[PDB]
């Protein structure tokens, strides 16, 4: 009887959360932005083509200086790229070739990498010996690592395949904070501009807002019908966008506690693998399974550009911090810089 | 050529990195990548010990082939989110205990897992090697407790040489794409030396098949 009592109590709390979100819904984002100027056809050409991987590229990440980027592929290699002159700065041999994520530290000193070995490896780029070197192996998960992002040189947050995000300490090597509450396994995370909150999308069609200091789940966003594969904060930090396997991108909202737009089209039936905003937050970039990359303006759901040019699934995407470039990676073992 | 001296030396560093990447890739392309699967309480540890925390990789050489098995049974996550990483393996070794027919039951779970990996969208052209393991105490477990417990449609005798072939035909009938891939099958035990010779012959036929596809002969 106690299980049914708390069951009905949780139903009543979900009903009052739904009633609060319905009472806050006074006008949609389509009804307000019907008077702004629609953006033109965003024509973007392949400036650089980075061709050094020999297997499927699963993740990339930009540097803070908007010139260096790292990319992870399952040929067992992790390559630092000079995006201006197409030079390979470093080539990092991985102990486990089955990697699914990579991160570039905002100081530029470190590079993270992880995957199906349940280990976030931290690589030191700037040593006295001249070579790259693994500094720490953060081994505390039981599921596969799906995303990792540095807070600073000493703190990193990882999302894993065991319905659990974790906050690490690089110097000691243990989990400072464990973030639990998802029921499906978490596929991506995204830090806020002020490194105090992060969102995470899992395979239970829910995205949760996490507080890094206290370690609690603040808000929970349910609008999708399938597994959320990618997530990214808006540049304001008051919104984020998710990309799922139901061929839709959705713009959620932290203060309004519910979704705003759905970025969908009837000719699109494949899942989103990657999502990123522009520098202004006006454009919304999204990588697909039908080998393309589509660009919506975020203020109105209409597709304003197609970044076609890959021959397999666009698995990773990054808009740089200057907004000058978009690096798209794919399973055809090529990175492409778009502008 | 409008490059500085450090730019030219950085290009030389990048070209040396390119040479190392090409050498490592053409070394890695000479290796046989095997995906090791199986149901719960399988006897895969015995044949791994014969052939020798998410993926237990196992590198071993045999008759100038460099095999690398990837024991991924133990990755307790949603398999649909990471099974596309193994697109391009040479074969798949799938381990079934034959004595798990009485312990739905374990054998129907094995059939469901084999049907899930065999008809998967990422392994349409991948051959599957199938060790039907623990055949020794299966042969004495079928003394009492007949196969009607597991397969009630079975009407043959309670002997070993018919029931084992019936279980083999029930697993091989789960293949929907019978034209593209093959299902190699071996009755194995714990004390069985020839478990590496069978996977050697099976990947030899798979390499010959891929070479017939590559050389235009198919």
């Amino acid at each position: 009887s106690e299980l049914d009592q708390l069951r009905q109590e949780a139903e009543q709390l979900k009903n009052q959360i739904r009633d609060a979100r319905k009472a806050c819904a006074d006008a949609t984002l389509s009804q307000i932005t019907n008077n702004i100027d629609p953006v033109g056809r965003i024509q973007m050409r392949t400036r650089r083509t980075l061709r050094g991987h020999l297997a499927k590229i699963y993740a990339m990440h930009w540097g803070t200086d908007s010139r260096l980027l790292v990319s992870a592929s399952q040929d067992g290699k992790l390559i630092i790229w000079d995006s201006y002159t197409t030079n390979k700065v470093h080539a990092i041999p991985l102990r486990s070739s089955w990697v699914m994520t990579c991160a570039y530290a905002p100081s530029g000193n470190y590079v993270a990498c992880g995957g199906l070995d349940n280990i976030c490896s931290i690589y030191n780029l700037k040593t006295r010996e001249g070579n790259v070197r693994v500094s720490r192996e953060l081994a505390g998960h039981t599921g596969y690592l799906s995303c990792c992002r540095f807070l600073d040189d000493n703190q990193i947050v990882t999302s894993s395949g065991d319905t659990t995000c974790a906050l690490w300490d690089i110097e000691t090597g243990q989990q400072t904070t464990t973030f639990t509450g998802h029921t499906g396994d978490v596929m991506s995370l995204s830090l806020a501009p002020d490194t105090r909150l992060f969102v995470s999308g899992a395979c239970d069609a829910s995205a949760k807002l996490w507080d890094v200091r206290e370690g609690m789940c603040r808000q929970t966003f349910t609008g999708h019908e399938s597994d959320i594969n990618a997530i990214c904060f808006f540049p304001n930090g008051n919104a984020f966008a998710t990309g799922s396997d139901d061929a839709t991108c959705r713009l959620f909202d932290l203060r309004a506690d519910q979704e705003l737009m759905t970025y969908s089209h009837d000719n699109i039936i494949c899942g989103i693998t990657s999502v990123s905003f522009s520098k202004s937050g006006r454009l919304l970039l999204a990588g697909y399974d039908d080998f393309n990359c589509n660009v919506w303006d975020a203020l109105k759901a209409d597709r304003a550009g197609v970044l076609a040019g890959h021959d397999n699934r666009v698995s990773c995407l990054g808009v740089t911090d200057d907004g000058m470039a978009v690096a798209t990676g794919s399973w055809d073992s090529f990175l492409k810089i778009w502008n | 050529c409008t490059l500085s001296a450090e730019d030219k030396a950085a290009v030389e560093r990048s070209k040396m990195i390119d040479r190392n990447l090409r050498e490592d890739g053409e070394k890695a392309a000479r290796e046989v990548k095997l995906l090791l699967l199986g149901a719960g309480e399988s006897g895969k540890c015995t044949i791994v010990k014969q052939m020798k925390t998410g993926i237990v990789e196992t590198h071993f050489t045999f008759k100038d082939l460099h095999f690398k098995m990837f024991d991924v049974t133990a990755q307790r996550s949603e398999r649909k989110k990471w099974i596309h990483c193994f697109e391009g393996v040479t074969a798949i070794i799938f381990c079934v205990a034959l004595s798990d027919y009485d312990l739905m039951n374990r054998m129907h779970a094995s059939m469901k897992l084999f049907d899930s990996i065999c008809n998967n969208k990422w392994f349409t052209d991948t051959s599957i090697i199938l060790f039907l393991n623990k055949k020794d105490l299966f042969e004495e477990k079928i003394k009492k407790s007949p196969l009607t417990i597991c397969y009630p449609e079975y009407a043959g005798s309670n002997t070993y040489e018919e029931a084992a072939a019936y279980i083999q035909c029930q697993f091989e009938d789960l293949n929907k794409r019978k034209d593209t891939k093959e299902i190699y099958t071996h009755f194995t035990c714990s004390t069985d030396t020839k478990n590496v010779q069978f996977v050697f012959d099976a990947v030899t036929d798979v390499i010959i098949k891929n070479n017939l596809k590559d050389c235009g002969l198919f």
Partner: single-chain antibody
Amino acid sequence: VQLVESGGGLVQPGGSRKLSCSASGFAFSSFGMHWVRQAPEKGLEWVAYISSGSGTIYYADTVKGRFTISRDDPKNTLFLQMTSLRSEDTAMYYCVRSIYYYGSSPFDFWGQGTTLTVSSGSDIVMTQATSSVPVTPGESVSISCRSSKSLLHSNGNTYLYWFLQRPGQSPQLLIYRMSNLASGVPDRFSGSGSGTAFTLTISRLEAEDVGVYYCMQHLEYPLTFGAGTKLEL
């Protein structure tokens, strides 16, 4: 990380001698290597360079066709084969490692160097006006230098390096571009400048940063140093 140069001694003029530098403590195979000499009363001048993997070998148009630089990758030594030693080759020969990628610090570690004693045009000219500057600690010292052509390359980088040679020690890298501070170097040192005119500024001094400063260009080969500025008292 260390570089021990060996060989040297008294050599009759017109003879031959091979110098070795056994590297220890770093990835030797991924570093370009330079030999840079220093006359017993004069400053520094570049001699030879071999790249990583021995792909590019440069000489100084004074030893070209006369010295031979070679490196060994498994055994970590660096060789400089010298034939036909004239009287203008008596110096202490320093070995210095140098990596080149985007954002790297070339010329960051210098060997201790060994002594060699012999018996009996289109380059860029570094020019430092002040030969000796007397100074007290706590002050701020602005040392200037100038070039022949503009060291600002078209890609934005300006290739002027600032070094420091303590009395009785090997030179040390201070500033590894026009304004980039090297590792292990305090925040007092600050490089600046533009075009063909550059200035290293010391905000406040200590006792250990006295000695001779040298400026080097890395825009074009051959690499040319300046007549160094001495700081005493």
